[PDB]
């Protein structure tokens, strides 16, 4: 199958100045008919896809004109004239020339804003859950910016990896902050066989790790 | 011109749906039909495409085609048939009708995610996240609530029955690997506040009809 | 036979008319790589040729001294050399509309400007998508229409070249 | 008139070949209503009763026994009642083309498993935006087409009924 790659798969973009996002083809699109076909999608969060730039250089009724698009037949430049804090969500390129069609990976195009340093809570396990049988444990990092972040678990200051799961959610309506979450789940057993548990946070606003601990037992 | 399509429907695997992309407003048998799906991870993929006026189909070529595809003339409805079910079928399906001369795909259906799990059906577990003593940093102080082991999606939370809402952060749900969903949902709050009002998250699981509110410094 | 020579002059008015007949049917102006058998404007000036060769032999049909057969010869050795021209010509555009073109064959202004923007020889879409399209069960009904046509244009040229063949003794 | 008579058969058989030319140009499936000119099958029946009208006329030109001038008024009345018959076609086929066609007359299967889903009457998409389409240009140049083609039937129908009014005297 003819495969599609894009650069990059994410973008922070700030109001105003820059707009660059790129689609190539792995087989030189064209018909030698001296137009090349190409369509252009966009998933808005939470909906069904619509088509933001059909044939590559004309754009659709009702869409506002601040959009372009042109290339050589190889390499091709998406451009918006005024990036604006609406036209967020995923956009994919596509090529229609031959079966089977194809579609691109997808580039997640998001709002750059200040930076802002995180913030960490830790919450300890509750004894409902102890007396069942199970303990999670739940790391938090409120509000932060980039979403890049890395968050290493020690418990006795050794490094556990596998017994954890990510989530991150959607940037909100107005604040446009970002939020992590990271679960973690162990017997009751295994938890009572370590004491001291420990979240290193490091990011690009914070000087140096923070570490919050708590110890089992005594408040 | 709309295009309304099927509800959602979870199932296990090996099972089958049939999805209907039912629409109204143009000749239905002057356009295509086709199916596309969206996995998580990946990006959009086409999975097939068939002609109601007269029963043409396209295929991919990578899906062996295992797909089975019909047209019902009488109502204008076409059906999509997913048999073997796997794992990595999980994905919104979406019907789109082809207009011709350019403009391929304006109009597009809402789409209808489907799950494949060989779970069942199981109540949610609501634990509270208590504040600690240490947990006096000033200024705000987060809480929430825990709502574990539910199954399938979706799930809602809101806090006093909905007499708060900003600041609220519920914590999409991905995956698990012991086949149950759970989740979090935190918020920001004045701290001062802690020692003498308490809150209660309701957590409303509708495949299973079940509520439940669970009751701070400690 | 030559004894029938009157009845053969009613035919050659009515080749000539429809001869105008199917040259005004090609001035349609479909597309901008017009066939070949109109840019050149044959038909008009073959069937008005054919059309003074006709009427001329039509009410006379006697033994004057000179113009009369002087006339008649040379318009006779002109309507084989056009006959042979619309052979040769019907042989060519067949095979332009059933097989690729090759020659180009540029149009007129006046109608190019009405329709420039399609093709006709090859009208078969990129996309696959467009299989079950308009612009091809349109297209095979056009390549259809030159087909019928054409056809109908070879059949009358052979009838005239026979008859021609038949009556130049 | 009488005093060439013995030359008018031929233009009766030329005029049954035309209209046996141009109902075979009508025959193809163009759209999914074809014109009343072609689903009623009146030209191949036209031209028969054309060419064997004919080929009676020129066969003596002398007083037969009783076979030929009997024949001869019983072949004429019905090819007069074909005539006027065509006639009333025509002049309903030309609203239908130019006017929304009232009547349906729908087309044979054999013909339309080719091309079952264009309209020839009313090629106007819903959405006002979508009418710069190659489907519309193609349309409107086969309105051109057809009109051209009807047109020159009805001139061809009206010389052939005015030979035929001034000769049968």
């Known amino acids: 199958d003819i495969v599609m790659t894009q650069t990059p798969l994410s973008l922070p973009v700030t109001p105003g100045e820059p707009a660059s996002i790129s689609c190539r083809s792995s087989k030189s699109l064209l018909h030698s008919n001296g137009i090349t076909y190409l369509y252009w999608y966009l998933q808005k969060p939470g909906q069904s896809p619509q088509l933001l730039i059909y044939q590559m250089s004309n754009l659709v009724s009702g869409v506002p004109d601040r959009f372009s698009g042109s290339g050589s037949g190889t390499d091709f430049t998406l451009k918006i004239s005024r990036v604006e804090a609406e036209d967020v969500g995923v956009y994919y390129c596509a090529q229609n020339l031959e079966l089977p069609y194809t579609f691109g990976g997808g580039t997640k195009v998001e709002i750059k804003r200040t930076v802002a340093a995180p913030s960490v809570f830790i919450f300890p396990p509750s004894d409902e859950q102890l007396k069942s049988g199970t303990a999670s444990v739940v790391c938090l990092l409120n509000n932060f910016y980039p979403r890049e972040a890395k968050v290493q678990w020690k418990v006795d200051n050794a490094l556990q990896s596998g017994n954890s799961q990510e989530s991150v959610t959607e940037q909100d309506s107005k604040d446009s902050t970002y939020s992590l979450s990271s679960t973690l789940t162990l017997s009751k057993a295994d938890y009572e066989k370590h004491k001291v548990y420990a979240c290193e946070v490091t990011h690009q606003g914070l000087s140096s790790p923070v570490t919050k601990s708590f110890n089992r037992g005594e408040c | 011109v709309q295009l309304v399509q099927s509800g959602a429907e979870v199932k296990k695997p090996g099972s089958s749906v049939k999805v209907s992309c039912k629409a109204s407003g143009y000749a239905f048998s002057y356009s295509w039909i086709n199916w596309v799906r969206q996995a998580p991870g990946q990006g959009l993929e086409w999975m097939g495409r068939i002609f109601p006026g007269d029963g043409d189909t396209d295929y991919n070529g990578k899906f062996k085609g295992r797909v089975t595809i019909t047209a019902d003339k009488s109502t204008s409805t076409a059906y999509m048939e997913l048999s073997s079910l796997r794992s990595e079928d999980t994905a919104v399906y979406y019907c789109a009708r082809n207009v011709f001369d350019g403009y391929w795909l304006v109009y597009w259906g809402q789409g209808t995610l489907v799950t494949v799990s060989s779970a069942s059906t199981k109540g949610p577990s609501v634990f509270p996240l208590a504040p600690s003593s240490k947990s006096t940093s000033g200024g705000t102080a987060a809480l929430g609530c825990l709502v574990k082991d539910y199954f399938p999606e979706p799930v809602t939370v809101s806090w006093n029955s909905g007499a708060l809402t900003s600041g609220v952060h519920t914590f999409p749900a991905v995956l698990q690997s012991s086949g149950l969903y759970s989740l979090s949902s935190v918020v920001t709050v004045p701290s001062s506040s802690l020692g003498t009002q308490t809150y209660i998250c309701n957590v409303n699981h509708k495949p299973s009809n079940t509520k439940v509110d669970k009751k701070e410094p400690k | ?169």
């Not at chain 3, 004894?3 to 001869?19: C, D, P, W, Y």
């Not at chain 3, 044959?42 to 040729?49: A, Q, R, S, V």
């Not at chain 3, 006959?83 to 060519?92: D, E, P, R, V």
Request: proline content about 4%.
């Open chain 3, 1 to 169: 036979f030559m004894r029938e020579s009157k009845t053969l002059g009613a035919v050659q008015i009515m080749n000539g008319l429809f001869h105008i007949a199917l040259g005004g049917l090609l001035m349609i102006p479909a597309g901008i790589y017009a066939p070949i058998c109109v840019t050149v404007w044959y038909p008009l000036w073959g069937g008005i040729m054919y059309i003074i060769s006709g009427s001329l032999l039509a009410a006379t049909e006697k033994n004057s001294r000179k113009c009369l057969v002087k006339g008649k010869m040379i318009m006779n050795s002109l309507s084989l050399f056009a006959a042979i021209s619309g052979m040769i010509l019907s042989i060519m555009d067949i095979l332009n509309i059933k097989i690729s073109h090759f020659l180009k064959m540029e149009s007129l202004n006046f109608i190019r400007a009405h329709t420039p923007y399609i093709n006709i020889y090859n009208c078969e879409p990129a996309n696959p998508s467009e299989k079950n399209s308009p612009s091809t069960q349109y297209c095979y009904s056009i390549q259809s229409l030159f087909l019928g046509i054409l056809s109908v244009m070879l059949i009358f040229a052979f009838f005239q070249e026979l008859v021609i063949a038949g009556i130049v003794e």
